[PDB]
Amino acid sequence: NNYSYIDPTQLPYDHKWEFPRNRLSFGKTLGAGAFGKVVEATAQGLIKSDAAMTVAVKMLKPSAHSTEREALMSELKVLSYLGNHENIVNLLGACTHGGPTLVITEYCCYGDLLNFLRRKRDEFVPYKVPEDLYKDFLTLEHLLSFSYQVAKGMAFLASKNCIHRDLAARNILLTHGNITKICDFGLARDIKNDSNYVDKGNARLPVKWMAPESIFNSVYTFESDVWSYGIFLWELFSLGSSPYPGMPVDSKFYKMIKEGFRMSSPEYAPAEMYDIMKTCWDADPDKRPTFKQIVQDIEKQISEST
Numbered sequence: 001n002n003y004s005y006i007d008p009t010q011l012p013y014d015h016k017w018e019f020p021r022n023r024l025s026f027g028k029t030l031g032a033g034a035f036g037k038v039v040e041a042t043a044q045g046l047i048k049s050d051a052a053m054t055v056a057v058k059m060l061k062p063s064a065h066s067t068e069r070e071a072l073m074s075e076l077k078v079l080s081y082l083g084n085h086e087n088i089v090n091l092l093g094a095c096t097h098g099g100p101t102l103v104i105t106e107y108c109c110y111g112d113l114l115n116f117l118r119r120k121r122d123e124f125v126p127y128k129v130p131e132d133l134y135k136d137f138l139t140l141e142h143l144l145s146f147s148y149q150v151a152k153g154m155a156f157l158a159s160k161n162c163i164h165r166d167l168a169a170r171n172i173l174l175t176h177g178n179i180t181k182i183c184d185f186g187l188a189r190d191i192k193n194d195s196n197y198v199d200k201g202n203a204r205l206p207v208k209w210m211a212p213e214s215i216f217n218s219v220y221t222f223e224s225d226v227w228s229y230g231i232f233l234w235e236l237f238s239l240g241s242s243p244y245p246g247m248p249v250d251s252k253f254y255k256m257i258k259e260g261f262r263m264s265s266p267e268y269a270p271a272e273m274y275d276i277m278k279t280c281w282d283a284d285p286d287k288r289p290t291f292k293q294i295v296q297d298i299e300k301q302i303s304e305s306t
């Protein structure tokens, strides 16, 4: 089962979310996997004054089977259960009557964070971008803010007993004002053809982001998400590089993780952020920081840079 602690079969779908599907107008695909996709759409009458707005809509493809139909309804129940939160992609509505399940969220102006970092990598500026302000250079200040916002969103998920299990820059969205939103593409990512997912047993898993207890024992906990957040930090401060660069996931990789090999600091990581990474990758889950502790650590770093 994919729910470590919460039980979505006992969580109620709040009908306040229900939206008439005929008021959606579908546009371009934002991401697609084997069985699901997310599309841009315009929603009419979602706003009380009958102004139009752009949203993102998740739906299954005709390729989908009963398992995926149940999974999408479970996902909707979990998002409804989580409720509103500024660091999580905002649920706006859903369509459950009169057709297949549709899940409607806000549209995030700048897309996923991994591609944003790669797009901005070549013009990154560590300190002090004035006359150059119009270019919207990526700065160290932004990276610290991203780390802080994702940690705050993850502390929220943990406070709801929710385990992400695929925390990574590809599952962070960026909107106006350098604001991040944790999401989960899930079935709307083509993991079959994504080299960041690796065949393990009968599954395709994000092995380079996974804690050892998740790889070898299929254990998913608050503490295993913290390990993934450590890998996410490495992506962030390497400006979108793939982790363990040049290492295939093979028997040698699993042995090195078990033996205690860990990545060195990426080129742009402040020492105190690498400190967080190292503690997130402790072999002992009980010695990793909590997300709440990470939030307090990074908040101090941000106030000390200013």
Ligand SMILES: Cc1ccc(NC(=O)c2ccc(CN3CCN(C)CC3)cc2)cc1Nc1nccc(-c2cccnc2)n1
Pocket (backbone or CB within 6 Å): 002, 003, 030, 031, 038, 056, 057, 058, 075, 078, 079, 089, 103, 104, 105, 106, 107, 108, 109, 110, 111, 112, 162, 163, 164, 165, 173, 182, 183, 184, 185, 188
């Ligand atoms: C339209 C939609 C429907 C559902 C979701 N779902 C989630 O974001 C999500 C996040 C966390 C959980 C919690 N869950 C707990 C259990 N573990 C195993 C999985 C995660 C569930 C759903 C997002 C979206 N939004 C979305 N998804 C992908 C891309 C985009 C997008 C892309 C580009 C521009 N703007 C938006 N927008």
Ligand SMILES: [Cl-]
Pocket (backbone or CB within 6 Å): 060, 069, 072, 100, 101
């Ligand atoms: Cl469906």
Ligand SMILES: [Cl-]
Pocket (backbone or CB within 6 Å): 002, 003, 004, 005, 006, 161, 162, 163, 164
């Ligand atoms: Cl969960």
Ligand SMILES: [Cl-]
Pocket (backbone or CB within 6 Å): none
């Ligand atoms: Cl060190």
